[PDB]
């Protein structure tokens, strides 16, 4: 996150860090004691070397580490250039016991809409500057949902955002999620309800003509319930 703020430690106990050989790769959201929801493009990796770490604030710190038994990418995931259905569910090799630092975030209703104007925020350990390095501490950034039609403007995303995608903007031009931030949850409203999983931007994180986009959670809730086996 570029231009964001350090969170209060463990104030977002659903946060997962997906890591390869101890190195952070993407965020995730714990959506069940045995399942982390994250971005599918994050799993273009040798799974043998991937771990999920829970309850972290500071990135170099133990937290609680899980091996991954299975990585189930959405059936209709299409990678770049079309980054469609950019979601994967990861099965932990143990079962999370809810505590103060680690806890699942509930899925929204399957009929949640994320309307233009909705005030949200997201969290991650991603880059703090263009071409920089990961954040040492978990950070957060307020984001507002933009009208998808305006985001699809020729100078912006040029018709390529589907109805399942949530177009986002910070309050300032110099604030944006950046590399390492995908997979992490977008929570919206006063009740801080899970509404999206961050996906993509353009190569430059703060490019105002390429606002960040998250995959909306609500249209995938029934898939998620089928996969997790919890109707």
């Amino acid at each position: 996150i570029i231009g964001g703020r350090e969170v209060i430690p463990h104030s977002r106990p659903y946060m997962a860090s997906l890591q390869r050989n101890g190195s952070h790769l993407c965020g995730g959201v714990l959506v069940h004691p045995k399942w982390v929801l994250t971005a599918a493009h994050c799993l273009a990796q040798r799974m043998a070397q991937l771990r999920l770490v829970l309850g972290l604030h500071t990135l170099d710190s133990p937290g609680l580490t899980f091996h991954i038994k299975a990585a189930i990418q959405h059936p209709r995931y299409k990678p770049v250039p079309a980054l469609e259905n950019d979601l994967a569910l990861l099965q932990l090799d143990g079962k999370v016991k809810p505590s103060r630092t680690i806890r699942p975030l509930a899925l929204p209703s399957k009929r949640q809409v994320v309307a233009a104007g909705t005030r949200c925020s997201m969290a991650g350990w991603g880059l703090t500057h263009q071409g920089g390095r990961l954040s040492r501490v978990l950070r957060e950034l307020d984001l507002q949902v933009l009208d998808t039609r305006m985001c699809n403007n020729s100078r912006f995303w040029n018709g390529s955002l589907s109805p399942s995608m949530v177009c986002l903007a910070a309050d300032s031009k110099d604030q944006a999620p950046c590399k390492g931030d995908s997979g992490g949850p977008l929570v919206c409203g006063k009740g801080r309800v899970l509404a999206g999983v961050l996906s993509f931007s353009s190569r430059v994180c703060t490019d105002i003509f390429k606002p960040p986009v998250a995959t909306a959670v609500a249209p995938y809730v029934s898939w998620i319930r089928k996969v997790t086996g919890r109707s």
């Binding site: 971005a39 493009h41 994050c42 770049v80 250039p81 079309a82 980054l83 950019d86 991603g126 040029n158 390529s160 999620p177 950046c178 590399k179 390492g180 931030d181 995908s182 961050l198 996906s199 993509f200 931007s201 353009s202 190569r203 994180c205 390429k210 960040p212």
Partner: peptide, 6 residues
């Protein structure tokens, strides 16, 4: 053009 995964 260019979607770049975050």
């Amino acid at each position: 053009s260019g979607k770049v995964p975050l």
